[PDB]
Amino acid sequence: DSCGAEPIHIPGAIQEHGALLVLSAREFSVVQASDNLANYIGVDLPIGAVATEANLPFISVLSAWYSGAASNFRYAWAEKKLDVSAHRSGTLVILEVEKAGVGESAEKLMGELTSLAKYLNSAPSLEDALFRTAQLVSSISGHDRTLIYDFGLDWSGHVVAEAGSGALPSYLGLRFPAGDIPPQARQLYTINRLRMIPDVDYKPVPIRPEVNAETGAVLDMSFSQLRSVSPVHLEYMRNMGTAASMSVSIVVNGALWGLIACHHATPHSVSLAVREACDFAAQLLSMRIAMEQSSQDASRRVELGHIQARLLKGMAWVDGLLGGEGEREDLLKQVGADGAALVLGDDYELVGNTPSREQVEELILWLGEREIADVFATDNLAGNYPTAAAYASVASGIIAMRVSELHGSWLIWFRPEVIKTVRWGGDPHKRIHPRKSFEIWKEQLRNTSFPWSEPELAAARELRGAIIGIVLRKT
Amino acid sequence: DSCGAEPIHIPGAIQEHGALLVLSAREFSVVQASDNLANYIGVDLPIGAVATEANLPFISVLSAWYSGAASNFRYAWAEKKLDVSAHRSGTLVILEVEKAGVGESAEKLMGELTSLAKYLNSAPSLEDALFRTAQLVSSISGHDRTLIYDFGLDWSGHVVAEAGSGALPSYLGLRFPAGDIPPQARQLYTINRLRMIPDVDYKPVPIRPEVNAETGAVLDMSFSQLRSVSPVHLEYMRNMGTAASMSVSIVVNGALWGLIACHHATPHSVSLAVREACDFAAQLLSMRIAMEQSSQDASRRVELGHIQARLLKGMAWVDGLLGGEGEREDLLKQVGADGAALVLGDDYELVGNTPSREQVEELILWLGEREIADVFATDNLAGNYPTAAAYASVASGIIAMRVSELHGSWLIWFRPEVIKTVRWGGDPHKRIHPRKSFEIWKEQLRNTSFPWSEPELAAARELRGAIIGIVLRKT
Ligand SMILES: *CCC1=C(C)C(=O)N=C1Cc1[nH]c(Cc2[nH]c(CC3=NC(=O)C(C=C)=C3C)c(C)c2CCC(=O)O)c(CCC(=O)O)c1C
Ligand SMILES: *CCC1=C(C)C(=O)N=C1Cc1[nH]c(Cc2[nH]c(CC3=NC(=O)C(C=C)=C3C)c(C)c2CCC(=O)O)c(CCC(=O)O)c1C
Ligand SMILES: [Mg+2]
Numbered sequence: 036d037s038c039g040a041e042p043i044h045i046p047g048a049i050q051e052h053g054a055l056l057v058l059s060a061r062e063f064s065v066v067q068a069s070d071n072l073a074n075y076i077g078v079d080l081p082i083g084a085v086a087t088e089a090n091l092p093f094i095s096v097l098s099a100w101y102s103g104a105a106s107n108f109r110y111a112w113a114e115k116k117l118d119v120s121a122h123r124s125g126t127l128v129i130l131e132v133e134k135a136g137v138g139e140s141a142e143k144l145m146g147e148l149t150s151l152a153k154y155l156n157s158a159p160s161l162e163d164a165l166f167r168t169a170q171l172v173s174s175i176s177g178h179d180r181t182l183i184y185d186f187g188l189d190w191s192g193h194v195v196a197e198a199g200s201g202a203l204p205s206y207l208g209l210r211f212p213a214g215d216i217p218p219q220a221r222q223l224y225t226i227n228r229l230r231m232i233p234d235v236d237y238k239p240v241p242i243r244p245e246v247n248a249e250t251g252a253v254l255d256m257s258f259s260q261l262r263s264v265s266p267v268h269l270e271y272m273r274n275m276g277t278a279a280s281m282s283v284s285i286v287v288n289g290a291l292w293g294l295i296a297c298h299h300a301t302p303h304s305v306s307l308a309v310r311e312a313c314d315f316a317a318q319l320l321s322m323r324i325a326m327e328q329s330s331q332d333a334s335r336r337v338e339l340g341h342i343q344a345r346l347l348k349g350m351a352w353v354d355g356l357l358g359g360e361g362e363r364e365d366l367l368k369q370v371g372a373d374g375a376a377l378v379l380g381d382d383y384e385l386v387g388n389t390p391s392r393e394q395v396e397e398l399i400l401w402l403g404e405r406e407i408a409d410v411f412a413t414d415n416l417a418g419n420y421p422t423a424a425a426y427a428s429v430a431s432g433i434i435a436m437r438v439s440e441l442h443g444s445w446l447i448w449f450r451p452e453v454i455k456t457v458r459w460g461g462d463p464h465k466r467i468h469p470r471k472s473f474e475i476w477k478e479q480l481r482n483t484s485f486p487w488s489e490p491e492l493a494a495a496r497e498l499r500g501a502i503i504g505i506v507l508r509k510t
Numbered sequence: 511d512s513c514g515a516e517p518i519h520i521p522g523a524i525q526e527h528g529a530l531l532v533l534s535a536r537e538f539s540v541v542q543a544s545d546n547l548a549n550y551i552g553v554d555l556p557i558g559a560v561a562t563e564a565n566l567p568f569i570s571v572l573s574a575w576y577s578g579a580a581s582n583f584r585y586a587w588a589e590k591k592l593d594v595s596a597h598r599s600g601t602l603v604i605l606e607v608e609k610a611g612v613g614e615s616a617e618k619l620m621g622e623l624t625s626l627a628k629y630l631n632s633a634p635s636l637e638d639a640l641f642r643t644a645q646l647v648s649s650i651s652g653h654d655r656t657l658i659y660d661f662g663l664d665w666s667g668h669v670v671a672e673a674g675s676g677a678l679p680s681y682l683g684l685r686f687p688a689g690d691i692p693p694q695a696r697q698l699y700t701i702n703r704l705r706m707i708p709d710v711d712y713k714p715v716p717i718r719p720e721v722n723a724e725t726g727a728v729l730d731m732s733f734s735q736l737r738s739v740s741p742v743h744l745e746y747m748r749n750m751g752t753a754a755s756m757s758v759s760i761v762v763n764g765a766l767w768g769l770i771a772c773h774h775a776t777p778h779s780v781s782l783a784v785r786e787a788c789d790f791a792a793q794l795l796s797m798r799i800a801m802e803q804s805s806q807d808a809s810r811r812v813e814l815g816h817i818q819a820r821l822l823k824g825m826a827w828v829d830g831l832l833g834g835e836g837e838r839e840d841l842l843k844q845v846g847a848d849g850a851a852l853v854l855g856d857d858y859e860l861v862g863n864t865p866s867r868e869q870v871e872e873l874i875l876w877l878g879e880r881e882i883a884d885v886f887a888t889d890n891l892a893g894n895y896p897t898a899a900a901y902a903s904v905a906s907g908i909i910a911m912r913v914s915e916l917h918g919s920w921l922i923w924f925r926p927e928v929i930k931t932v933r934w935g936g937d938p939h940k941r942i943h944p945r946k947s948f949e950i951w952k953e954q955l956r957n958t959s960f961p962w963s964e965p966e967l968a969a970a971r972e973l974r975g976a977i978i979g980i981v982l983r984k985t
């Protein structure tokens with residue numbers, strides 16, 4: 036990705052809806068500031084000046100915070116009607132100010148948050164849990180759209196939940212390309228779980244001096260809430276017809292699972308408290324996704340565990356896999372397959388729904404001349420072996436694993452073609468600029484089967500280990 | 511348990527710090543009421559009277575709630591300075607009123623709750639997570655003591671965290687008998703996760719009429735917050751020197767994991783909001799306990815999975831288990847054992863630290879004349895086989911499993927004695943009344959090893975399945 040090279044974490048500028056101040060940990064001395072600082076705190080700070088009580092009324096609370104082991108500082112500056120926040124960046128304190136929450140009770144958030152935390156510890160369906168999470172953020176945020184964006188393995192995303200006022204187009208069930216959120220952006224959103232763009236056509240406020248006197252470097256704005264965004268994304272937002280946006284990162288098992296992406300037809304800001312309330316709903320959803328994944332994976336390994344047990348003691352041999360109706364049923368269910376080919380030399384045994392003997396014969400030749408270490412798995416065989424499109428209907432996906440390289444022996448599982456129409460939020464394929472159109476773009480995905488789960492690949496590799504060793508013993 | 515027979519869920523009376531009203535779902539008609547109702551709502555309701563706006567200002571909100579699918583009703587009656595709550599009980603609405611929270615911001619709770627939710631999604635150590643949870647409840651509740659009570663397998667409990675003002679004795683690390691919380695109490699606390707006794711010497715307020723006209727039965731007060739407690743527990747609290755108590759249920763994977771038990775030297779009440787804030791911290795802790803248990807169990811099965819793999823292909827045979835230093839090391843590590851006896855007929859093979867050949871010989875005779883189905887496991891062999899105390903130091907715990915009933919073959923793992931002093935909160939063994947003394951009571955637990963984990967028992971049963979079938983093949 037060429038767009039993945041832009042350093043979005045060091046723009047040296049912020050958005051209009053707040054001001055930024057950089058203090059030296061030791062002296063609490065002014066090192067850098069936004070040109071709009073004076074406008075917000077009604078007090079001009081020269082670079083080198085030491086922050087006193089006169090300057091900042093909260094200086095004694097900030098000093099006590101920094102000495103502490105709390106990651107972030109938050110203070111309600113009642114006098115100026117400002118929300119003050121700060122984080123640690125090496126030997127620096129990056130302090131940010133924004134207009135305070137203009138009327139909103141904590142029990143308004145607390146009360147509406149409990150309704151979801153209580154809902155999704157009973158541990159219901161995910162879809163329903165996703166929607167409930169989206170529907171909450173939608174309420175407290177007040178955005179014209181609040182959708183949940185689940186990342187795929189290729190880092191393309193599929194909209195799995197949606198709440199809206201009706202002012203913005205509905206994207207529920209739409210798929211978006213990986214380039215919409217480039218790698219370095221995905222990496223930043225993994226560690227920094229919040230971001231807000233109240234106005235797409237904000238005029239960036241420079242931070243001066245450009246070079247920080249303490250570090251001799253530009254400011255690391257990775258954890259700056261006011262950080263000026265990448266122009267290419269603003270251009271993207273303008274094309275989507277979104278004047279304002281806010282997104283919360285859903286981080287599960289240390290990885291970026293998805294986003295709670297909120298958009299608005301016209302400029303729209305959210306209070307520090309409400310933003311933290313949304314980051315908190317994202318963590319509740321995150322806590323649940325992990326458990327259901329953990330339990331569904333556990334249930335699957337138990338289910339395949341019962342099947343493996345019957346096969347392993349059935350062999351203790353090929354009639355342990357091929358014996359009668361029961362043995363062959365277990366062979367296919369072992370990895371949730373519809374067919375299997377057990378090829379031991381020139382002896383072919385086809386179970387359930389398989390390609391022709393000749394077609395399977397040609398597949399083993401194609402596999403043999405490729406570096407197939409333990410097992411080869413794909414849910415789209417046609418993608419690498421175009422010839423396989425002829426029997427896509429019976430074997431769109433396979434798990435192939437050799438049991439005796441010397442004898443040219445293989446156990447291959449087959450999965451049939453599962454046809455589905457992929458709704459794309461515009462044309463995927465089409466300095467790089469964002470696409471102007473986001474109209475439902477449909478493609479018929481052919482020659483692709485249901486994906487192979489990790490429990491299934493684990494069960495496959497385990498049966499291979501049992502077969503290999505028997506053949507080793509017999510030979 | 512004879513104390514486990516008392517029906518604590520139908521006392522037909524409440525505590526003094528609130529009033530209770532029973533309404534018929536259809537008419538919202540008065541069926542039952544506490545004798546102190548008039549005192550609280552300043553309006554006397556005759557049985558048969560229909561609840562109007564004049565009677566209850568919140569009647570239109572309650573009506574809209576009941577029609578809805580929300581489990582519980584909560585309303586802030588500003589006029590009377592009362593917190594109103596209600597739940598569904600068949601065709602009935604059980605409505606309860608108590609004095610409103612006398613000064614406490616939602617951001618006071620919200621702010622102090624986030625500090626723990628943020629702390630324990632980074633997924634640190636449990637002990638630290640337990641203490642952080644206890645230390646929060648201690649702050650918002652304002653109790654003289656806030657401890658976390660982890661239930662054992664025998665339903666005896668061990669204090670694993672503690673926060674206190676110093677006014678009440680410290681019980682951290684103390685163990686309490688199962689009879690302190692009898693079964694029917696444990697069962698109620700599994701479904702009803704909150705309970706509060708602001709004053710131990712409250713005079714129970716009767717509910718009349720005793721018989722509910724709608725059901726022809728006494729009121730099911732399972733989900734009554736004001737429910738009058740069992741006299742034997744109040745007598746228990748008086749002996750502990752606790753005038754007030756509040757406890758939240760920690761429910762993990764559907765089972766009662768433990769309690770957050772709060773006690774106070776003098777009478778002390780907690781607001782509906784703060785009680786719900788504590789029930790909510792208990793769920794945060796609960797969400798975490800489940801994940802660490804889930805991940806620790808996963809990590810263990812992977813670790814033992816690597817060991818099993820080496821043994822299974824090593825046999826493919828007894829030299830697969832007994833071959834050299836590596837094979838024998840894996841045999842012991844398979845279930846985290848220090849010794850093993852592989853007895854195949856009259857042929858004995860002792861690995862690592864085992865009892866004498868004769869001692870193991872006598873153990874197989876004792877096992878043979880007991881209904882040992884698949885495997886027999888214990889962390890205290892002396893408890894059932896007193897003779898085994900002679901070699902408690904080498905084999906305090908064992909996993910024994912026969913591999914050929916016809917040949918009298920066995921694989922037995924040995925774990926050495928791990929001596930520890932069990933601190934008891936009073937004398938465990940000593941109409942039944944509670945013990946008067948809760949002074950640290952010490953016993954030296956001898957002839958007991960580290961407990962056998964489920965992954966270890968699973969790994970044991972799996973190796974048995976591999977050995978059996980080989981011996982079947984060889985024989
Ligand atoms: C460089 C080219 C590029 C193309 C072409 C493109 O489509 N996007 C980029 C770059 C890019 N994108 C972002 C950040 C970002 N993307 C999205 C995507 C999104 N929001 C939605 O609502 C939907 C679908 C419904 C999609 C697919 C979001 C949410 C964000 C984060 C900001 C926000 O919440 O709006 C960046 C990084 C911007 C920055 O942080 O500076 C870049 C460079
Ligand atoms: C019938 C005899 C009996 C003996 C003897 C005894 O010790 N307890 C009973 C009965 C019993 N206990 C309870 C409820 C209860 N027990 C505890 C225990 C406890 N609190 C602590 O702080 C510690 C240690 C530090 C222990 C071991 C708690 C917390 C509770 C719940 C109420 C509370 O929070 O105090 C009942 C049921 C009471 C009821 O709900 O009506 C009974 C019958
Ligand atoms: Mg995904």
Ligand SMILES: [Mg+2]
Pocket residue numbers: 660661662663767
């Ligand atoms: Mg326990």
